[PDB]
Write a protein that binds this ligand. Structure first.
Ligand SMILES: N[C@@H](CCC(=O)N[C@@H](CS[C@H](CC(=O)O)C(=O)O)C(=O)NCC(=O)O)C(=O)O
Ligand SMILES: N[C@@H](CCC(=O)N[C@@H](CS[C@H](CC(=O)O)C(=O)O)C(=O)NCC(=O)O)C(=O)O
Ligand code: NA
Ligand code: NA
Lengths: 214, 214
């Protein structure tokens, strides 16, 4: 028995979890679920995950869903390197940074939402881009402001080691680029993204590096 | 110094955090931020929370944001009663249930999103209700299915005691009622909501019980 990651190359939440798995050095089988072909909406995937979203992680004993919960599980199950700080204040700050992305940006721009905008509200692609940029810019305004007020911060979102906040931020910056969001206002975010981009664990997790990529 | 909770009566994330505070028996000063009057969008609130959303919790030493992160902080800071189980599997499951609501339902139906639908896409109130019901029903389909397959469950989302999953679920059911979502398909969810509704900590946290309520 071994871990199986049901996921997709060009998927922010998949990318997020791949970064965390790679940072922990945890081996996994990559099982592509082709979202463009709507494979996640088939009964076969529903049997694994009733929510019919990616990623899902089969540990060999059970199927875990929800990247935020899976990542917290990885942190506890595979201690080294730590992706959360040891102190209560730092724990809260890193979780808050992650949740800005995980709650207040990513879900709003997810495929199913954009499909609803297109099919119910008749959104064209300019309108889709304007929607996505609205939520990314609002979230990045806050994330950037938080990066600025932290005096102890190094190269990454928190301190001078990668944390789970970076696992959320990096895929979100990639989505921002996809939707042609002006990132000029976010130099601290851009610097964190660049620093993470130097690391093997992040490079190996990037959409373009995946088996199912174009 | 003491706890100051910046929040609003008719607010799902405020309600969510109020439940957790009440379960912990942690005293706090209720500081109303009137969302209808757009008080959260004023510079005074921006100075407290750069994201300009509620809730924010001033501990007396610093201002915490992001209800998921604040609730995790409360669990660690105020151990009794435990709102998370002790075992890795249970921890992950409770976090996953919470994240279905906190990531994949609540943010999609938030005020700012509905405002954008109205002002950019010309949505009338029937269209707003149809949008909200789409995401609530999808999330509740998954949540209901997950409740059904847990054989160790008592009256609540997980186990025999309230957990942070219930803190997220109860406000989400209230929002469902607000948007006239058919809850007939979700008898397990309705039973959890009813069970939580018997408890003082939940009753005291409900929108209609707040100082700034109608
Ligand atoms: N809170 C959950 C959210 C998972 C879910 O949003 N996953 C996306 C992940 S793929 C999505 C693809 C896209 O938006 O183009 C992305 O994040 O990039 C989903 O499978 N989309 C399919 C759909 O909306 O039909 C989690 O973090 O695991
Ligand atoms: N992930 C964050 C999300 C916080 C945020 O979404 N809060 C809402 C809380 S109030 C909201 C009010 C509503 O939707 O009518 C609700 O949840 O009920 C916000 O202040 N809305 C103001 C706005 O959109 O302009 C958190 O959980 O703290
Ligand atoms: Na890149
Ligand atoms: Na009620």
């Amino acid at each position: 028995a071994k871990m199986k990651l049901y996921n997709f190359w060009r998927s922010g939440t998949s990318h997020r979890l791949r970064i965390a798995l790679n940072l922990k050095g945890v081996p996994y089988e990559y099982l592509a679920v082709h979202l463009g072909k709507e494979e996640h909406l088939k009964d076969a995937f529903k049997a694994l995950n009733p929510q019919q979203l990616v990623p899902a992680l089969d540990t060999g004993a059970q199927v875990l869903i929800q990247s935020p919960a899976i990542i917290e599980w990885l942190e506890e199950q595979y201690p080294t390197p730590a992706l959360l700080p040891a102190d209560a204040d730092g724990r809260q700050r890193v979780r808050a940074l992650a949740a800005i992305v995980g709650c207040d940006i990513h879900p709003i721009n997810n495929r199913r939402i954009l499909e609803y905008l297109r099919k119910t509200f008749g959104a064209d692609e300019a309108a889709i881009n304007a929607w996505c940029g609205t939520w990314i810019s609002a979230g990045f305004d806050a994330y950037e402001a938080l990066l600025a007020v932290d005096p102890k911060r190094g190269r990454y979102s928190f301190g001078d080691t990668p944390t789970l906040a970076d696992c959320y931020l990096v895929p979100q910056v990639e989505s921002a680029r996809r939707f042609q969001v002006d990132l000029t206002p976010y130099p601290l975010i851009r610097a964190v993204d660049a620093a993470c981009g130097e690391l093997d664990a992040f490079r190996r997790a990037a959409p373009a590096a995946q088996p199912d990529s174009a």
